[PDB]
Amino acid sequence: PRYELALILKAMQRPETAAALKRTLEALMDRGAVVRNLENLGERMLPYKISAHNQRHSRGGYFLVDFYAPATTVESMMEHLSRDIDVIRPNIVKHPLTQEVKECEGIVPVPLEEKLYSTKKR
Amino acid sequence: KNILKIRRRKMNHHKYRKLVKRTRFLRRKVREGRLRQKQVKFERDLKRIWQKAGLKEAPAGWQTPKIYLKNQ
Amino acid sequence: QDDPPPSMLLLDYQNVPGIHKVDDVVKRLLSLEMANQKEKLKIKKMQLMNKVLENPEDTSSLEARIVALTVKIRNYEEHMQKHRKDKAHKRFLLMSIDQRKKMLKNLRETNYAVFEKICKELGIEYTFPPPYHRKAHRRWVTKKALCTQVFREVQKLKKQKRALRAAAVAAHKQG
Amino acid sequence: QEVLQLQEEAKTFITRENLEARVEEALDSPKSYNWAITREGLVVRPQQK
RNA sequence: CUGAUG
RNA sequence: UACACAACCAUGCAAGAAGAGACAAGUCGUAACAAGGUAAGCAUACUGGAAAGUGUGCUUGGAUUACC
RNA sequence: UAACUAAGCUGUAAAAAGCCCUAGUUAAAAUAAAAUAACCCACGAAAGUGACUCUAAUAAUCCUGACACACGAUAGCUAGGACCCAAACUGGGAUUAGAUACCCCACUAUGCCUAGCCCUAAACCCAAAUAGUUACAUAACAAAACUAUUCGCCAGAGUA
Numbered sequence: 001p002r003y004e005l006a007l008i009l010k011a012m013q014r015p016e017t018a019a020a021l022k023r024t025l026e027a028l029m030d031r032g033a034v035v036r037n038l039e040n041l042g043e044r045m046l047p048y049k050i051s052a053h054n055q056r057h058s059r060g061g062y063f064l065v066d067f068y069a070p071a072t073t074v075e076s077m078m079e080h081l082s083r084d085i086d087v088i089r090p091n092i093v094k095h096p097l098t099q100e101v102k103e104c105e106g107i108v109p110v111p112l113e114e115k116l117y118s119t120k121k122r
Numbered sequence: 123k124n125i126l127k128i129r130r131r132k133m134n135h136h137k138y139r140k141l142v143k144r145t146r147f148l149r150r151k152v153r154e155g156r157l158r159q160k161q162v163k164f165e166r167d168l169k170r171i172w173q174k175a176g177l178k179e180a181p182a183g184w185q186t187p188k189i190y191l192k193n194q
Numbered sequence: 195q196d197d198p199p200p201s202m203l204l205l206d207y208q209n210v211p212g213i214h215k216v217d218d219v220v221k222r223l224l225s226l227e228m229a230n231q232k233e234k235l236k237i238k239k240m241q242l243m244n245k246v247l248e249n250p251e252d253t254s255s256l257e258a259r260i261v262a263l264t265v266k267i268r269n270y271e272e273h274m275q276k277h278r279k280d281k282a283h284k285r286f287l288l289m290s291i292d293q294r295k296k297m298l299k300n301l302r303e304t305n306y307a308v309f310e311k312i313c314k315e316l317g318i319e320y321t322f323p324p325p326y327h328r329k330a331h332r333r334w335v336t337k338k339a340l341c342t343q344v345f346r347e348v349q350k351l352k353k354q355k356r357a358l359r360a361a362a363v364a365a366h367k368q369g
Numbered sequence: 370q371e372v373l374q375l376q377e378e379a380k381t382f383i384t385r386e387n388l389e390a391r392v393e394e395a396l397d398s399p400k401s402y403n404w405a406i407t408r409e410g411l412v413v414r415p416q417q418k
Numbered sequence: 419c420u421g422a423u424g
Numbered sequence: 425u426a427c428a429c430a431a432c433c434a435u436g437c438a439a440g441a442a443g444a445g446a447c448a449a450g451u452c453g454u455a456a457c458a459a460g461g462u463a464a465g466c467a468u469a470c471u472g473g474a475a476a477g478u479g480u481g482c483u484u485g486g487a488u489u490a491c492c
Numbered sequence: 493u494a495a496c497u498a499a500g501c502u503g504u505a506a507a508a509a510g511c512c513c514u515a516g517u518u519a520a521a522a523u524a525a526a527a528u529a530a531c532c533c534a535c536g537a538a539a540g541u542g543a544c545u546c547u548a549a550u551a552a553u554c555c556u557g558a559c560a561c562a563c564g565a566u567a568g569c570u571a572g573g574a575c576c577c578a579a580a581c582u583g584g585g586a587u588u589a590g591a592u593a594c595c596c597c598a599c600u601a602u603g604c605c606u607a608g609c610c611c612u613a614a615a616c617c618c619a620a621a622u623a624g625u626u627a628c629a630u631a632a633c634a635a636a637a638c639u640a641u642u643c644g645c646c647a648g649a650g651u652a
């Protein structure tokens with residue numbers, strides 16, 4: 001996976017969520033991207049009341065879309081997702097797997113710095 | 123210590139600023155009078171060129187614009 | 195201008211066998227379409243070093259460094275054409291141009307044939323640094339224009355006088 | 370090896386045919402990424418409850 | 419809270 | 425023979441304008457040297473008889489007394 | 493900006509002035525700025541930068557080197573836009589013999605965005621760059637004393 005779409009859909013019914021995800025993935029496939037997988041993180045309580053599309057959202061369904069897309073459609077996908085009233089807050093980031101987990105060496109013992117003052121007798 | 127000379131330069135600059143504020147327009151008159159003579163000297167130095175080169179009048183298509191009298 | 199195709203199959207996945215046997219869904223992800231700008235930079239650098247240079251393995255050569263900096267200069271120009279107020283990239287470009295010109299001077303002083311071929315292939319017009327670097331102000335520009343026009347008028351009137359004298363001599367030698 | 374691994378991932382991609390299947394699959398198979406840690410350096414997952 | 423000079 | 429021919433400078437004077445300096449003593453305030461009694465100073469802008477005051481950034485050529 | 497409650501709210505060592513279209517709670521756009529993380533010291537040539545995400549990208553197979561070129565915080569100017577909040581100036585209320593100041597309230601330019609200028613700082617880490625040494629060696633303090641090639645400066649102070 002290259003990119004990652006965190007989608008926050010409005011709390012709605014099962015066929016409505018299905019159609020919303022269908023049209024979102026259809027738009028992402030029309031914009032020139034192949035969808036790898038889709039993961040539903042469950043309908044949880046929002047940490048804060050989000051106000052979007054003149055609506056006070058208290059809950060929201062979280063979705064995770066990992067895919068590959070060119071660098072020229074990231075803004076177009078965001079502009080398409082922003083105007084959707086069923087989308088509360090969309091986010092397009094890099095997938096955390098493309099950053100290889102470098103070797104966490106550990107707590108390197110750092111000594112106390114010396115030679116900071118002259119040897120003059122006080 | 124060094125604040126002596128610092129405050130000395132501060133007082134001198136403050137007095138200079140006050141003098142400029144008190145005699146602002148006289149300084150502008152002097153500046154205009156100097157720029158006028160500057161443009162006149164430039165015009166005469168240009169006119170001397172073709173006269174020492176042999177030309178009686180100025181070359182064709184020569185206007186000699188004002189480079190010092192440019193408005194803000 | 196160079197136009198890398200979207201299905202270029204970038205160098206990281208080009209020399210390995212079995213690249214044309216996979217399907218289009220895999221080729222399109224292993225191509226330049228889903229790639230970033232650094233991949234296009236690498237592709238342009240490879241395609242320029244394979245056609246302009248003679249030994250692409252000798253990267254430590256001045257002729258190779260000039261091409262590697264020319265690619266970056268053209269990329270920075272492409273960036274400037276979109277971003278006007280970008281000062282850091284503008285300084286990068288203006289200093290990379292000076293470094294490329296210094297290496298061009300060194301190449302011209304070392305090997306004339308390679309320098310002349312690099313210039314003809316890359317379109318870089320090597321200019322000689324004009325001595326007496328001065329800021330041309332309005333007074334100097336006006337006086338130089340006046341002196342040039344005076345010189346032209348003086349030589350024109352002298353040519354006309356010489357023509358009139360030649361005609362008067364030809365009319366006097368005949369009768 | 371990277372090309373061969375990507376070839377296997379192309380088998381489970383979402384397409385026009387698999388769209389209606391993957392939608393109803395993800396809407397019925399939720400996932401969770403919450404996992405805590407301990408002072409010794411071991412992880413725990415709330416899926417054991 | 420404020421209190422100038424030699 | 426046909427043209428510019430005191431314009432350009434230098435030397436003195438000038439009705440006058442402004443500044444700097446020394447020159448025992450004045451008038452009006454206390455600006456800084458002590459957290460100089462509002463901590464200073466730099467760039468800049470405004471204001472005030474005056475030293476100066478204030479605003480925006482910047483340095484300590486000041487401390488915050490050091491298991492407090 | 494609307495709804496409930498009260499005649500009070502803000503304000504200093506103490507008050508006065510100001511507001512009583514005020515004050516508290518519940519909701520609420522637009523603008524400005526970006527708690528803790530930071531006991532971190534990274535990025536960038538410097539000024540500068542630490543609310544989140546995306547694209548581009550951070551020169552030199554790497555010496556020094558201008559009056560040339562390109563940048564250069566805040567503050568200032570021009571045109572258009574924005575204005576919660578703070579505030580040059582200004583108008584009031586305190587204190588003082590006086591206070592056109594430090595204290596309190598209101599308010600403007602301005603701080604905010606785009607385009608174009610101005611190119612200034614205690615632009616200080618007051619310690620120039622390039623590769624090194626711990627040899628001789630404490631004017632004083634401060635950040636210990638120094639090498640080889642350089643660039644730019646330094647001739648008492650005020651006048652400046």
Ligand SMILES: [Mg+2]
Pocket residue numbers: 130133134
């Ligand atoms: Mg003086």
Ligand SMILES: [Mg+2]
Pocket residue numbers: 459
């Ligand atoms: Mg005190």
Ligand SMILES: [Mg+2]
Pocket residue numbers: 460
């Ligand atoms: Mg005092």
Ligand SMILES: [Mg+2]
Pocket residue numbers: 462
């Ligand atoms: Mg004071």
Ligand SMILES: [Mg+2]
Pocket residue numbers: none
């Ligand atoms: Mg004071």
Ligand SMILES: [Mg+2]
Pocket residue numbers: none
């Ligand atoms: Mg006082």
Ligand SMILES: [Mg+2]
Pocket residue numbers: 463464
């Ligand atoms: Mg002091």
Ligand SMILES: [Mg+2]
Pocket residue numbers: none
């Ligand atoms: Mg101050």
Ligand SMILES: [Mg+2]
Pocket residue numbers: none
């Ligand atoms: Mg000042």
Ligand SMILES: [Mg+2]
Pocket residue numbers: 471478
């Ligand atoms: Mg004031």
Ligand SMILES: [Mg+2]
Pocket residue numbers: none
């Ligand atoms: Mg005030």
Ligand SMILES: [Mg+2]
Pocket residue numbers: 486
């Ligand atoms: Mg001190």
Ligand SMILES: [Mg+2]
Pocket residue numbers: none
């Ligand atoms: Mg009252």
Ligand SMILES: [Mg+2]
Pocket residue numbers: 522
């Ligand atoms: Mg508003």
Ligand SMILES: [Mg+2]
Pocket residue numbers: 526543
């Ligand atoms: Mg913040």
Ligand SMILES: [Mg+2]
Pocket residue numbers: none
């Ligand atoms: Mg650095």
